[PDB]
Amino acid sequence: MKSITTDELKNKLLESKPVQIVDVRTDEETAMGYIPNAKLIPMDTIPDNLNSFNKNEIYYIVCAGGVRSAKVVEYLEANGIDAVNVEGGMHAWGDEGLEIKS
Phi, psi of 34, deg, nearest 5: -140, 170
Is residue 11 within 8 Å of 93, Cβ to Cβ?
no
Domain 2-102, CATH number (from 3.40.250.10, 3.90.1150.10, 3.40.50.150, 3.40.50.1010): 3.40.250.10
CA angle 42, 15, 68 (to 5 degrees): 20
Residues classed as catalytic: 63
Pick from 80, 69, 71, 84: nearest CA to 9: 84
Q: Identify the bridge partners of residue 54 per DSSP, sorted by sequence position.
A: none
The strands making up 3-4's β-sheet, listed across from edge to edge, are 3-4, 82-86, 58-62, 20-23, 39-40
The residues spanned by each domain of the chain are 2-102
This structure's resolution (Å) is 2.0
